[PDB]
């Protein structure tokens, strides 16, 4: 619920004649966008001056009704304009298409007995915001009938605040997009499209989207001259052919590097993601050494846990797996990360920013540099040093000097990893690399006021809040459009300790988001989310909300994130306050559910879906054995027990359900969806 000023409630209760006025602020298309001109309108009989803005009366005949529910969807509102006005008819007819995606802000204003606006909204001591969105259509109906009165109505179609969620806002590996270069028209030209002012100088994504498929010829310092380690059986006989030592010899290498431009993901937990190779190359003289830089996740990242070299991770899952192939430590119970290689027999801990790990294994050796994302991080020192010496083949082939990998290639806000392979007769090619990365660092807002963003969090509420407050890869919603206290309380609600299982039952604790093997981490919901930014932010938000069954609503300009939960202070409504219309309907027969199919990736085995079905035997017996499955999203959950508790909770909750619909006067203004109502009606026994 949106609390309104006490004086507002007193006026609404006392006064039976409310002179409501709707204030419309509409954005006209025009050049010089910074000079954005607005046309203000109102359906009140006189012009209303509100905060120095004069809302002209007339031209507004009617306004539709704003509607919202617990499922995220793009609400729509349509308001009409008098078609007899010349300005409006011309605007709609000859510019009604240029008006698309232009802002409109409708305010609901109660007018005092003295013509002033009653300060309903406590946040501004002003009106209570009624609608906000962007136009999405037009339409005019000039109906002329002979011998009568004609009609000319202009209809404007709008979408509510959630139409801003149709955007896809994800960093794209292409150099032109990342650096903000203008859409190329012939030659290139810099512009101001960069997400951050410091991106323009970041050439990190250079060499990103290109396909160098050539028959390169290399000079290998070997097998042409100098002493050769071959001694004949005879004491005096010797091998006069000189080779197996440094001297040039021609060699044709048919390299084929296809670095595409894929959307970078975002990870909010311990999840396994692939690499997006942004730079590929091989040493100038030895083709067997290849440098490939992969892009993982975004922003400051807690670090890498492990690297998957062609489906074979560097750490063996159990005791059993270690015999099949070489490994280093276990993951089942010890649950150590990759950082054991640098610090043998240490504790479990994520990787280190700018630290090299030499993964020595059969078939060759691998050198990995873990560069965690950072708002301001320097260029890859190793690559810069190599470039200064012109060690890269494609650098000399294209003629680039020490700028091929310059100090200015500081990949910002990207947790990339440099992997140096040593191609041999055993590792004959470069295998696709995947890694287990901890999520992005996420802000947690304590109730007192202090925050902490030093680690990633599994809480769904805070993950959604972080995704909804980042302009560079999420929805550009400022923190000042969120009720902090309510969000914090909901986050606490999603952190209730669950007692259906012990912490010792899940062995793969480190790889389900648990940072400690002892401390209490039985949260009721734990989401290890991969936010593929390729999809619309609308779909990402819906996917996050479907994990814990929450709901996001924006009525009165505040973004409410709420979850079906009990309340000890519900709003009391008596039937006599209703308009007297009532309708109780039963939906239990339709919504009875007794099973659910859970396809969840289990870290215990190489990350792969387990088709697990949760069913409630008692419900099936009541259902006469008939199967009834509710589609439940397990994509963001890797902990088996949290998934099971979620499934059982939903199955239980789907057993009793009725829909009660009535109406209520304007006294009860500000009833958000998912609000606790205490409806008392003595005739029914309620």
């Amino acid at each position: 619920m949106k609390k309104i000023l006490d004086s507002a409630k007193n006026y609404l209760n006392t006064h039976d004649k409310l002179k409501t006025a709707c204030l419309i602020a509409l954005e006209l298309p025009s050049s010089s966008g910074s000079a954005a001109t607005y046309i203000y309108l109102t359906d009140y009989f006189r012009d209303v001056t509100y905060n120095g803005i004069l809302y002209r009366s007339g031209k507004v005949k009617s306004i539709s009704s704003h509607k919202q529910n617990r499922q995220l969807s793009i609400g729509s509102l349509s308001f009409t304009i008098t078609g007899t006005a010349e300005d409006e008819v011309l605007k709609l007819v000859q510019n009604g298409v240029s008006f698309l995606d232009r802002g409109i802000t409708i305010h609901q204003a109660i007018i005092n007995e003295e013509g002033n606006i009653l300060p309903v909204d406590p946040d501004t001591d002003g009106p209570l915001l009624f609608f906000r969105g962007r136009i999405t259509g037009g339409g005019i109906k000039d109906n002329v009938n002979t011998s009568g009165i004609g009609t000319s109505v202009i209809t404007w179609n709008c979408s509510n605040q959630f139409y801003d969620f149709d955007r896809v806002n994800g960093r794209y590996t292409d150099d032109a997009s990342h650096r903000g270069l203008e859409v190329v028209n012939g030659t290139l030209q810099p512009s101001n499209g960069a997400k951050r002012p410091e991106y323009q100088e970041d050439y990190g994504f250079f060499h990103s989207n290109k396909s160098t498929t050539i028959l390169a010829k290399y000079q290998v310092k070997e097998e042409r001259y100098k002493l050769q380690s071959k001694k004949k059986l005879f004491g005096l006989s010797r091998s006069y052919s000189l080779k197996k030592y440094y001297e040039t010899v021609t060699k044709e290498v048919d390299l084929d590097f296809n670095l595409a431009a894929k959307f970078i993901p975002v990870v909010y937990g311990v999840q396994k993601i692939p690499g997006i190779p942004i730079f590929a190359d091989t040493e100038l003289n030895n083709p067997n050494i290849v440098y490939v830089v992969y892009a993982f996740a975004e922003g400051e990242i807690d670090g890498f846990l492990d690297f998957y070299i062609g489906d074979s991770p560097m750490i063996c899952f159990d005791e059993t797996d270690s015999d099949t192939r070489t490994c280093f430590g276990r993951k089942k119970i010890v649950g150590d990360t990759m950082h054991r290689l640098a610090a043998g027999t240490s504790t479990s801990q994520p990787s280190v920013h700018g630290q090299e790990y030499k993964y020595n294994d059969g078939n060759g050796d691998i050198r990995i540099w873990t560069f965690h994302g950072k708002p301001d991080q320097t260029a890859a020192q190793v690559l810069v040093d190599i470039a200064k010496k012109k060690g890269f083949y494609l650098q000399n082939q294209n003629g680039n000097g020490p700028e091929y990998w310059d100090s200015r290639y500081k990949l910002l806000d990207t947790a990339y990893a440099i992997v140096r392979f040593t191609i041999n007769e055993n590792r004959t090619e470069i295998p696709e690399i995947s890694a287990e990365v901890q999520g992005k660092k996420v802000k947690v807002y304590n109730s007192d006021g202090t925050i902490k963003a030093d680690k990633t969090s599994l809480n769904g509420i805070w993950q959604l809040m972080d995704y909804l407050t980042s302009d560079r890869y999420g929805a550009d919603i400022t923190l000042d459009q969120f009720p902090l206290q309510k969000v914090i309380s909901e986050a606490k609600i999603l952190d209730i300790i669950d007692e259906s299982y012990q912490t010792s039952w899940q062995p793969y604790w480190r790889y389900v988001g648990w940072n400690d093997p002892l401390s209490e981490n039985r949260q009721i919901v734990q989401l290890n989310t991969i936010l593929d930014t390729s999809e619309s932010v609308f779909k990402n938000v819906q996917g996050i909300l479907e994990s814990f069954g929450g709901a996001i609503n924006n009525l009165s300009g505040e973004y409410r994130i709420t979850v079906e939960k009990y309340s000890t202070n519900p709003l009391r409504i008596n039937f006599l306050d209703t308009y007297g219309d009532l309708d109780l309907s039963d939906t239990t027969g339709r919504n009875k559910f007794n099973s659910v199919q859970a396809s969840l990736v289990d870290p215990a085995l190489s990350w792969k879906t387990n088709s697990i079905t949760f069913y409630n035997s008692k419900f099936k017996e009541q259902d006469k054995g008939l199967d009834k499955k509710l589609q439940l999203s397990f994509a963001n959950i890797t902990n088996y027990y949290t998934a099971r508790s979620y499934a059982d909770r939903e199955l239980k909750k789907s057993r009793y359900s009725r829909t009660l619909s009535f109406s209520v006067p304007y006294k009860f203004i500000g009833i958000e969806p998912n609000d606790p109502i205490a409806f008392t009606y003595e005739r029914y026994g309620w």
Partner: protein
């Protein structure tokens, strides 16, 4: 040396009406033991 005899496939159906147990994790990840999904002994 070693000989293996195989038959059937593990059933991933889980009855959430009964309380949770570690046997479910053992059974659902292919561990070696005696029992069903709702009651598994992992050796």
């Amino acid at each position: 040396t070693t000989q293996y005899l195989t038959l059937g496939e593990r059933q991933k159906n889980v009855d959430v009406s009964m309380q949770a147990s570690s046997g479910e994790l053992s059974y659902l990840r292919g561990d070696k033991g005696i029992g069903n999904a709702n009651s598994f002994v992992p050796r």
